[PDB]
């Protein structure tokens, strides 16, 4: 998280860290959704080029976390994963269209101060909340420029999809959105390298709950002018997201 | 999931967090 500020404790109750066993290793961020499972971006466990090609037994969560690199005896929960799910048409190879992955826990997290979930947007909500001008949540452990010791925050406007898109060269889809603030908006803050898989959060100001509308996908460099953070959307593929959660018993 | 989107120490306390307010006054 680039130009942005400290978490405060219980700020982020959804974070989740997600953690290579050997080495031992920070992966990526991710999103705590109910007590067994969890939300992440599919180039966190899928990206062949950078040999990520991750089974159930490489990688484990921890989950209620402030501190990047301390373990937190009481505070945080480490689980394993029982299986990995990634959306069927997720493209690595060009653009990370469809950049979702969900995780089953094998070891369910019993909820605290520290731990709780994040909802997951209703159609409603999604329109109404996901609109440019509409500033959302970003949160994170990973590069604080492009070259932290605990949890950032940055909030970060929605930017519409044709500044979106004349911003960059890579094809942008529906399967997507970006946010942060225009050059002459005096304002700045990013997602970097290592935030991808966290949450893009928004309070709804109807039932004041919090929401997650996008995943830390994509960027190019980070914090730059006239350059936007891209963040997988998350209700466009809602779709797939129930077909994997509503089909075990509990 | 039924209780989701309520932080215990913040929405549970009544209590609004550090940069909330930037949010909430973003939807005028």
Redesign the interface.
Same mark, same amino acid.
């Given at each position: 998280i680039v130009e942005g &500020?400290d978490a405060? #404790? !219980? $700020?982020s %109750?959804w974070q989740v860290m997600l953690f290579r066993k050997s080495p031992q290793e920070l992966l990526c961020g991710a999103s705590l #959704? +109910? =007590?067994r499972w969890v939300l992440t971006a599919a180039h966190c466990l899928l990206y062949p080029p950078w040999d990520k090609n991750f089974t159930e037994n490489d990688l484990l969560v921890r989950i209620g976390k402030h501190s990047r690199t301390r373990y937190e005896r009481n505070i945080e929960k480490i689980s394993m994963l029982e299986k990995i799910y990634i959306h069927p048409r997720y493209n690595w190879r060009e653009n990370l269209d469809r950049d979702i992955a969900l995780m089953k826990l094998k070891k369910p997290v019993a909820? +605290? =101060?520290?731990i709780? *979930?994040?909802?997951?947007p209703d159609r409603e909500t999604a329109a109404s909340l996901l609109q440019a !001008?509409?500033? !959302? /949540?970003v949160t994170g452990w990973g590069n604080l420029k492009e070259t932290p010791s605990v949890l950032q925050?940055v @909030?970060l *406007?929605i930017v519409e999809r044709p500044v979106c898109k004349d911003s960059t060269r890579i094809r942008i889809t529906d399967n997507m959105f970006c946010a942060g603030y225009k050059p002459d908006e005096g304002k700045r803050g990013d997602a970097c390298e290592g935030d991808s898989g966290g949450p893009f959060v $928004?309070? &709804? %100001?109807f @039932? @004041? /709950?919090?929401?997650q509308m996008g995943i830390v996908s994509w960027g190019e460099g980070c914090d730059r002018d006239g350059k936007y953070g891209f963040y997988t959307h998350v209700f466009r593929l809602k779709k797939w997201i129930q077909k994997v959660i509503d089909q075990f018993g509990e | 999931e039924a209780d989701c989107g309520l932080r215990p120490l913040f929405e549970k306390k009544s209590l609004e967090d550090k940069t909330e307010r930037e949010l909430l006054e973003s939807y005028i």
């Open positions: &500020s405060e #404790i !219980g $700020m %109750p #959704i +109910s =007590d909820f +605290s =101060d520290y709780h *979930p994040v909802c997951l !001008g509409y500033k !959302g /949540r925050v @909030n *406007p $928004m309070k &709804s %100001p @039932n @004041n /709950r919090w929401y | -």
